[PDB]
């Protein structure tokens, strides 16, 4: 039981899914992320109101 | 979808049950 309990889940966070991770819809300081500086990474970003 | 959105204990009674059934089957013997 406590093996199973071990193997069930996995203790490493979760890979990221894509743009849409659910710590991505609210950012918090725990969990910081950001891109290099003006440029097209951040184009598309002041582009995108989402 | 926009909005709104985002995102054993059972040891001690099998050890009580064992220690249960010794204790009938040494009063079975104390009786017999």
Same mark, same amino acid.
């Given at each position: 039981?406590?093996?199973?309990?071990?193997?069930?889940?996995?203790?490493?966070?979760?890979?990221? &899914?894509?743009?849409?991770?659910?710590?991505?819809?609210?950012?918090?300081?725990?969990?910081?992320?950001? &891109?290099?500086?003006?440029?097209?990474?951040?184009?598309?970003?002041?582009?995108?109101?989402? | 979808?926009?909005?709104?959105?985002?995102?054993?204990?059972?040891?001690?009674?099998?050890?009580?049950?064992?220690?249960?059934?010794?204790?009938?089957?040494?009063?079975?013997?104390?009786?017999?």
């Amino acid at each position: 039981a406590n093996l199973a309990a071990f193997l069930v889940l996995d203790r490493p966070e979760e890979r990221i &899914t894509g743009i849409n991770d659910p710590r991505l819809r609210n950012p918090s300081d725990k969990f910081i992320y950001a &891109t290099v500086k003006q440029s097209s990474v951040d184009i598309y970003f002041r582009r995108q109101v989402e | 979808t926009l909005w709104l959105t985002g995102i054993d204990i059972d040891n001690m009674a099998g050890v009580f049950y064992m220690l249960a059934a010794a204790m009938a089957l040494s009063l079975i013997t104390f009786i017999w």
